[PDB]
Design an enzyme around this catalytic site. Structure first.
Site, PDB file in Angstrom:
ATOM      1  N   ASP A 172      32.678  44.841  37.087  1.00 43.47           N
ATOM      2  CA  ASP A 172      31.494  44.012  35.550  1.00 43.47           C
ATOM      3  C   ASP A 172      30.878  42.582  36.927  1.00 43.47           C
ATOM      4  O   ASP A 172      30.599  41.517  36.811  1.00 43.47           O
ATOM      5  CB  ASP A 172      32.560  42.884  35.246  1.00 43.47           C
ATOM      6  CG  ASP A 172      31.705  41.845  34.373  1.00 43.47           C
ATOM      7  OD1 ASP A 172      30.864  42.423  33.733  1.00 43.47           O
ATOM      8  OD2 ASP A 172      32.837  40.987  33.916  1.00 43.47           O
ATOM      9  N   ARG A 214      25.335  37.080  34.854  1.00 42.87           N
ATOM     10  CA  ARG A 214      26.645  36.068  34.289  1.00 42.87           C
ATOM     11  C   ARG A 214      27.742  35.702  35.765  1.00 42.87           C
ATOM     12  O   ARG A 214      28.691  35.007  35.194  1.00 42.87           O
ATOM     13  CB  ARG A 214      26.851  36.461  33.212  1.00 42.87           C
ATOM     14  CG  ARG A 214      27.681  37.407  33.224  1.00 42.87           C
ATOM     15  CD  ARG A 214      27.769  38.016  31.713  1.00 42.87           C
ATOM     16  NE  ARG A 214      28.653  39.927  31.631  1.00 42.87           N
ATOM     17  CZ  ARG A 214      27.729  40.765  31.746  1.00 42.87           C
ATOM     18  NH1 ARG A 214      26.288  40.808  31.785  1.00 42.87           N
ATOM     19  NH2 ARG A 214      28.574  42.261  31.655  1.00 42.87           N
ATOM     20  N   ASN A 215      27.983  36.616  36.682  1.00 41.19           N
ATOM     21  CA  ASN A 215      29.100  36.902  37.419  1.00 41.19           C
ATOM     22  C   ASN A 215      29.600  36.304  38.722  1.00 41.19           C
ATOM     23  O   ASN A 215      29.668  36.096  39.754  1.00 41.19           O
ATOM     24  CB  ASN A 215      30.038  38.186  37.853  1.00 41.19           C
ATOM     25  CG  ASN A 215      30.902  37.987  36.387  1.00 41.19           C
ATOM     26  OD1 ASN A 215      31.354  37.182  36.308  1.00 41.19           O
ATOM     27  ND2 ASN A 215      30.700  39.174  35.924  1.00 41.19           N
ATOM     28  N   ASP A 223      34.097  36.204  39.715  1.00 42.72           N
ATOM     29  CA  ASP A 223      34.477  37.533  38.447  1.00 42.72           C
ATOM     30  C   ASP A 223      35.533  36.433  37.077  1.00 42.72           C
ATOM     31  O   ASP A 223      36.248  35.572  37.621  1.00 42.72           O
ATOM     32  CB  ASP A 223      35.288  38.167  38.954  1.00 42.72           C
ATOM     33  CG  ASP A 223      35.842  39.488  37.754  1.00 42.72           C
ATOM     34  OD1 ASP A 223      35.116  38.710  36.362  1.00 42.72           O
ATOM     35  OD2 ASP A 223      35.991  40.620  37.748  1.00 42.72           O
TER      36      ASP A 223
HETATM   37  C1  LIG Z   1      39.043  29.431  38.636  1.00 33.14           C
HETATM   38  C2  LIG Z   1      38.627  30.269  38.507  1.00 33.14           C
HETATM   39  C3  LIG Z   1      39.515  31.163  39.155  1.00 33.14           C
HETATM   40  C4  LIG Z   1      38.839  32.739  39.706  1.00 33.14           C
HETATM   41  C5  LIG Z   1      37.214  33.139  39.975  1.00 33.14           C
HETATM   42  C6  LIG Z   1      37.240  34.405  41.060  1.00 33.14           C
HETATM   43  O1  LIG Z   1      35.894  34.509  40.413  1.00 33.14           O
HETATM   44  N1  LIG Z   1      38.146  35.158  40.814  1.00 33.14           N
HETATM   45  C7  LIG Z   1      37.778  36.819  41.100  1.00 33.14           C
HETATM   46  C8  LIG Z   1      38.645  37.655  40.929  1.00 33.14           C
HETATM   47  C9  LIG Z   1      38.279  38.907  41.234  1.00 33.14           C
HETATM   48  C10 LIG Z   1      37.560  39.175  41.737  1.00 33.14           C
HETATM   49  C11 LIG Z   1      36.857  38.739  41.973  1.00 33.14           C
HETATM   50  C12 LIG Z   1      35.173  38.314  42.934  1.00 33.14           C
HETATM   51  F1  LIG Z   1      36.118  40.070  44.237  1.00 33.14           F
HETATM   52  F2  LIG Z   1      35.626  37.479  44.644  1.00 33.14           F
HETATM   53  F3  LIG Z   1      34.135  38.328  42.757  1.00 33.14           F
HETATM   54  C13 LIG Z   1      36.675  37.430  41.995  1.00 33.14           C
HETATM   55  C14 LIG Z   1      36.836  31.924  39.831  1.00 33.14           C
HETATM   56  C15 LIG Z   1      37.493  30.867  39.009  1.00 33.14           C
HETATM   57  N2  LIG Z   1      36.528  30.053  38.919  1.00 33.14           N
HETATM   58  C16 LIG Z   1      35.242  29.702  38.225  1.00 33.14           C
HETATM   59  N3  LIG Z   1      34.648  28.338  38.631  1.00 33.14           N
HETATM   60  C17 LIG Z   1      33.640  28.864  37.899  1.00 33.14           C
HETATM   61  C18 LIG Z   1      32.739  27.562  37.954  1.00 33.14           C
HETATM   62  C19 LIG Z   1      31.496  27.292  36.961  1.00 33.14           C
HETATM   63  C20 LIG Z   1      30.643  26.249  37.417  1.00 33.14           C
HETATM   64  C21 LIG Z   1      30.410  25.998  38.298  1.00 33.14           C
HETATM   65  N4  LIG Z   1      31.192  26.370  39.084  1.00 33.14           N
HETATM   66  C22 LIG Z   1      32.384  27.583  38.837  1.00 33.14           C
HETATM   67  N5  LIG Z   1      33.682  28.613  36.462  1.00 33.14           N
HETATM   68  C23 LIG Z   1      35.022  29.745  36.106  1.00 33.14           C
HETATM   69  N6  LIG Z   1      35.333  30.414  34.832  1.00 33.14           N
HETATM   70  N7  LIG Z   1      36.310  31.071  35.433  1.00 33.14           N
HETATM   71  C24 LIG Z   1      36.738  31.551  34.095  1.00 33.14           C
HETATM   72  C25 LIG Z   1      36.684  30.900  36.668  1.00 33.14           C
HETATM   73  C26 LIG Z   1      35.936  30.015  37.135  1.00 33.14           C
END
Ligand SMILES: Cc1ccc(C(=O)Nc2cccc(C(F)(F)F)c2)cc1Nc1nc(-c2cccnc2)nc2nn(C)cc12
Length: 277
Positions: free
Chosen positions: A136, A140-141, A154
């Site tokens: 994805d 937006r990610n 993500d």
């Molecule tokens: C709490 C949390 C948990 C998981 C993730 C996330 O990126 N997970 C993920 C899963 C698989 C793979 C990857 C990666 F590989 F890094 F891309 C990441 C992000 C976050 N942080 C987040 N930050 C933020 C956010 C918003 C505005 C400013 N800074 C962070 N928004 C989020 N929405 N959601 C649904 C999760 C958000």
């Protein structure tokens, strides 16, 4: 416990949830603070979650802890010993790249935009080499920090059709090479300040156009080398696309010889304005 080998367990007394900013698979995502105090994003797994949801949630925490890279969102830690369980990440001040670009139209230099793309590519090369297929990848990610550093993330939702490679749509073949296709779309998003790929074409019109050989046109004021690179990300033949290793190398060389970016791809004007003589 071994799944969390790269993570730090955080005590609940260290965390204050402040505002709901999204949804998880079975719980909310909050903006909050983590104890100095730092702002954080907090994803919860609330009471009633299934076994599959627990495995996936702790698996997500575990892989995020494994990832240690300048261009990947940083996991602060996890709460697994208390309920609700939590995944806690850094909080970016500038938010998501798509909204950021659209609110900052024309405010960056070409070198700044290309530097963003180099960072995204470096994060994706790291993910790919860590055997992680994103599926994805889209502006937006991606989060943006106060140094303009892009962090692949993500945020969850099925198939974002117009970001997705043909083989992933057709037969569900998601690989780092389909992530490269998506990266090409991200390049176009960045260089256009967040234009929507393919404008108002329907999903079926996009797929038909791609299968017939059409591709997105050049952004305005886009370096020739950058348009050439995104175009090669959109090869139908998955094996002909660059790897992220190639993308990182090319972007690094362009940035380090910045005169290489002064040559612009011809923009095809969709409208003609003739100033009468
Ligand atoms: C709490 C949390 C948990 C998981 C993730 C996330 O990126 N997970 C993920 C899963 C698989 C793979 C990857 C990666 F590989 F890094 F891309 C990441 C992000 C976050 N942080 C987040 N930050 C933020 C956010 C918003 C505005 C400013 N800074 C962070 N928004 C989020 N929405 N959601 C649904 C999760 C958000």
């Amino acid at each position: 416990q071994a799944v969390l080998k790269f993570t730090t367990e955080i005590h609940p007394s260290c965390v204050t949830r402040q505002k709901v900013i999204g949804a998880g698979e079975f719980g909310e995502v909050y903006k909050g603070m983590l104890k100095k105090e730092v702002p954080v994003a907090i994803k919860t797994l609330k009471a009633g979650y299934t076994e599959k949801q627990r495995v996936d949630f702790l698996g997500e925490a575990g892989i995020m802890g494994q990832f240690s890279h300048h261009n990947i969102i940083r996991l602060e830690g996890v709460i697994s010993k208390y309920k609700p369980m939590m995944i806690i990440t850094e909080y970016m001040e500038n938010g998501a790249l798509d909204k950021f670009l659209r609110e900052k139209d024309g405010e960056f230099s070409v070198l700044q935009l290309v530097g963003m793309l180099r960072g995204i590519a470096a994060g994706m090369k790291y993910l790919a080499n860590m055997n992680y297929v994103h599926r994805d990848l889209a502006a937006r990610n991606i989060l943006v920090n106060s140094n303009l550093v892009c962090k692949v993330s993500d945020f969850g939702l099925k198939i974002p059709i117009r970001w997705t490679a043909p083989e992933a749509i057709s037969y569900r073949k998601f690989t780092s090479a389909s992530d490269v296709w998506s990266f090409g779309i991200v390049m176009w998003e960045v260089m256009t300040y967040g234009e929507r790929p393919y404008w108002e074409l329907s999903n079926h019109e996009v797929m038909k156009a791609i299968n017939d050989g059409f591709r997105l046109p050049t952004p305005m004021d886009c370096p020739s080398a950058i348009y050439q690179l995104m175009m090669q990300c959109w090869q139908q033949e998955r094996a002909r696309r660059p790897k992220f290793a190639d993308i990182v190398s090319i972007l690094d060389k362009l940035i380090r010889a910045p005169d290489s970016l002064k040559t612009l791809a011809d923009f095809d004007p969709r409208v003609s304005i003739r100033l009468p003589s």
